[PDB]
Design an enzyme around this catalytic site. Structure first.
Site, PDB file in Angstrom:
ATOM      1  N   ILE A  54      31.342  41.608  29.976  1.00 56.45           N
ATOM      2  CA  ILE A  54      32.337  42.481  30.558  1.00 56.45           C
ATOM      3  C   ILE A  54      33.719  42.180  29.969  1.00 56.45           C
ATOM      4  O   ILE A  54      34.043  41.062  29.535  1.00 56.45           O
ATOM      5  CB  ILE A  54      32.365  42.398  32.100  1.00 56.45           C
ATOM      6  N   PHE A  96      27.257  35.729  43.721  1.00 55.53           N
ATOM      7  CA  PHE A  96      26.187  36.490  43.058  1.00 55.53           C
ATOM      8  C   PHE A  96      25.482  35.722  41.949  1.00 55.53           C
ATOM      9  O   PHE A  96      24.354  36.077  41.633  1.00 55.53           O
ATOM     10  CB  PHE A  96      26.638  37.888  42.609  1.00 55.53           C
ATOM     11  N   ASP A  97      26.076  34.676  41.377  1.00 56.46           N
ATOM     12  CA  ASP A  97      25.378  33.932  40.324  1.00 56.46           C
ATOM     13  C   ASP A  97      26.102  32.642  40.033  1.00 56.46           C
ATOM     14  O   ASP A  97      27.295  32.523  40.275  1.00 56.46           O
ATOM     15  CB  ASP A  97      25.274  34.763  39.040  1.00 56.46           C
ATOM     16  N   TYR A 156      29.575  28.900  34.630  1.00 54.92           N
ATOM     17  CA  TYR A 156      30.354  29.770  35.486  1.00 54.92           C
ATOM     18  C   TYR A 156      29.742  29.888  36.877  1.00 54.92           C
ATOM     19  O   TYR A 156      28.558  29.643  37.079  1.00 54.92           O
ATOM     20  CB  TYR A 156      30.493  31.173  34.866  1.00 54.92           C
ATOM     21  N   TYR A 210      32.398  46.020  36.222  1.00 53.61           N
ATOM     22  CA  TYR A 210      31.286  46.976  36.253  1.00 53.61           C
ATOM     23  C   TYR A 210      31.690  48.364  36.740  1.00 53.61           C
ATOM     24  O   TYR A 210      30.836  49.234  36.915  1.00 53.61           O
ATOM     25  CB  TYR A 210      30.145  46.417  37.084  1.00 53.61           C
ATOM     26  N   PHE A 216      35.457  34.843  39.059  1.00 53.83           N
ATOM     27  CA  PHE A 216      34.661  33.863  38.336  1.00 53.83           C
ATOM     28  C   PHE A 216      35.413  32.552  38.203  1.00 53.83           C
ATOM     29  O   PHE A 216      36.626  32.519  37.977  1.00 53.83           O
ATOM     30  CB  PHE A 216      34.354  34.333  36.913  1.00 53.83           C
TER      31      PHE A 216
HETATM   32  C1  LIG Z   1      25.200  41.312  38.487  1.00 53.85           C
HETATM   33  C2  LIG Z   1      25.320  39.879  38.004  1.00 53.85           C
HETATM   34  C3  LIG Z   1      24.904  39.765  36.555  1.00 53.85           C
HETATM   35  C4  LIG Z   1      23.440  40.275  36.467  1.00 53.85           C
HETATM   36  C5  LIG Z   1      22.892  40.096  35.034  1.00 53.85           C
HETATM   37  C6  LIG Z   1      22.952  38.626  34.630  1.00 53.85           C
HETATM   38  C7  LIG Z   1      24.386  38.113  34.725  1.00 53.85           C
HETATM   39  C8  LIG Z   1      24.974  38.305  36.132  1.00 53.85           C
HETATM   40  O1  LIG Z   1      24.246  37.503  37.083  1.00 53.85           O
HETATM   41  C9  LIG Z   1      26.424  37.797  36.063  1.00 53.85           C
HETATM   42  O2  LIG Z   1      26.799  36.766  36.634  1.00 53.85           O
HETATM   43  C10 LIG Z   1      27.486  38.527  35.277  1.00 53.85           C
HETATM   44  O3  LIG Z   1      28.044  39.470  35.839  1.00 53.85           O
HETATM   45  N1  LIG Z   1      27.833  38.111  34.058  1.00 53.85           N
HETATM   46  C11 LIG Z   1      27.169  36.989  33.363  1.00 53.85           C
HETATM   47  C12 LIG Z   1      28.186  35.992  32.807  1.00 53.85           C
HETATM   48  C13 LIG Z   1      29.212  36.735  31.967  1.00 53.85           C
HETATM   49  C14 LIG Z   1      29.934  37.755  32.803  1.00 53.85           C
HETATM   50  C15 LIG Z   1      28.941  38.799  33.368  1.00 53.85           C
HETATM   51  C16 LIG Z   1      28.469  39.691  32.243  1.00 53.85           C
HETATM   52  O4  LIG Z   1      29.240  40.152  31.434  1.00 53.85           O
HETATM   53  O5  LIG Z   1      27.159  39.946  32.244  1.00 53.85           O
HETATM   54  C17 LIG Z   1      26.659  40.784  31.160  1.00 53.85           C
HETATM   55  C18 LIG Z   1      26.103  42.060  31.759  1.00 53.85           C
HETATM   56  C19 LIG Z   1      25.836  43.113  30.690  1.00 53.85           C
HETATM   57  C20 LIG Z   1      27.114  43.698  30.092  1.00 53.85           C
HETATM   58  C21 LIG Z   1      27.507  43.412  28.777  1.00 53.85           C
HETATM   59  C22 LIG Z   1      28.671  43.962  28.215  1.00 53.85           C
HETATM   60  C23 LIG Z   1      29.430  44.852  28.974  1.00 53.85           C
HETATM   61  O6  LIG Z   1      30.553  45.468  28.530  1.00 53.85           O
HETATM   62  C24 LIG Z   1      30.948  45.328  27.134  1.00 53.85           C
HETATM   63  C25 LIG Z   1      29.048  45.165  30.282  1.00 53.85           C
HETATM   64  O7  LIG Z   1      29.861  46.038  30.935  1.00 53.85           O
HETATM   65  C26 LIG Z   1      29.471  46.472  32.242  1.00 53.85           C
HETATM   66  C27 LIG Z   1      27.888  44.593  30.823  1.00 53.85           C
HETATM   67  C28 LIG Z   1      25.666  39.959  30.383  1.00 53.85           C
HETATM   68  C29 LIG Z   1      26.049  39.543  29.122  1.00 53.85           C
HETATM   69  C30 LIG Z   1      25.254  38.773  28.312  1.00 53.85           C
HETATM   70  C31 LIG Z   1      24.038  38.413  28.837  1.00 53.85           C
HETATM   71  C32 LIG Z   1      23.646  38.787  30.109  1.00 53.85           C
HETATM   72  O8  LIG Z   1      22.442  38.486  30.585  1.00 53.85           O
HETATM   73  C33 LIG Z   1      21.569  37.790  29.720  1.00 53.85           C
HETATM   74  C34 LIG Z   1      20.990  38.532  28.506  1.00 53.85           C
HETATM   75  O9  LIG Z   1      21.095  39.789  28.359  1.00 53.85           O
HETATM   76  O10 LIG Z   1      20.416  37.782  27.680  1.00 53.85           O
HETATM   77  C35 LIG Z   1      24.471  39.566  30.912  1.00 53.85           C
END
Ligand SMILES: CC[C@@H]1CCCC[C@@]1(O)C(=O)C(=O)N1CCCC[C@H]1C(=O)O[C@H](CCc1ccc(OC)c(OC)c1)c1cccc(OCC(=O)O)c1
Length: 128
Positions: free
Chosen positions: A75, A55-56, A45, A101, A118
């Site tokens: 998310i 951002f990533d 992604y 978020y 994304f």
């Molecule tokens: C701010 C950007 C974000 C910072 C943490 C690492 C991922 C990140 O860079 C990013 O791109 C991001 O925003 N992601 C990652 C790719 C999937 C979509 C999104 C994400 O869901 O990241 C989650 C963040 C934690 C989260 C989980 C569940 C949620 O709701 C049910 C939620 O709501 C606000 C938030 C994520 C999910 C799984 C692993 C992640 O990082 C690695 C880890 O924990 O091993 C990060």
């Protein structure tokens, strides 16, 4: 740019039809069926704010991003969006804050009340 194109042309894939998650298929996948719930999915992604600020990207680190679909491990917009994809597909998603978020954001990179873009490639998935 890509986010505006999703605003204008994206399909509303939300259950509520609230435009919270909008999708364009950018490359059709050859996989026949969408993943089931709980399936282990593998993706690459790119993430940007709706203004285009990156951002990533999983490609920066040559690391597929792996999670179990439809379990709240990501998310809401991702559980909704990836559930609609075929293996090999690339899509663009535009995600309102309710499906991302929210009011808290994810500081420093993601402000409060941010709409996120994304690009997601579904590399593979395996049965729960
Ligand atoms: C701010 C950007 C974000 C910072 C943490 C690492 C991922 C990140 O860079 C990013 O791109 C991001 O925003 N992601 C990652 C790719 C999937 C979509 C999104 C994400 O869901 O990241 C989650 C963040 C934690 C989260 C989980 C569940 C949620 O709701 C049910 C939620 O709501 C606000 C938030 C994520 C999910 C799984 C692993 C992640 O990082 C690695 C880890 O924990 O091993 C990060």
């Amino acid at each position: 740019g890509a986010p505006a194109t999703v605003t204008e042309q994206g399909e509303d894939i939300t259950s509520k039809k609230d435009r919270g998650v909008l999708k364009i298929v950018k490359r059709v996948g050859n996989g026949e069926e969408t993943p089931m719930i709980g399936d282990k999915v593998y993706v690459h992604y790119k993430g940007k704010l709706s203004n285009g600020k990156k951002f990533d990207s999983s490609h920066d680190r040559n690391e597929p991003f792996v999670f179990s679909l439809g379990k709240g491990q990501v998310i809401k917009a991702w559980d909704i969006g990836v559930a609609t994809m075929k293996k090999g597909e690339i899509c663009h998603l535009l995600c309102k804050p309710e499906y991302a978020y929210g009011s808290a954001g994810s500081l420093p990179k993601i402000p409060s009340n941010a709409t996120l873009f994304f690009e997601i490639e579904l590399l593979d998935f395996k049965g729960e």
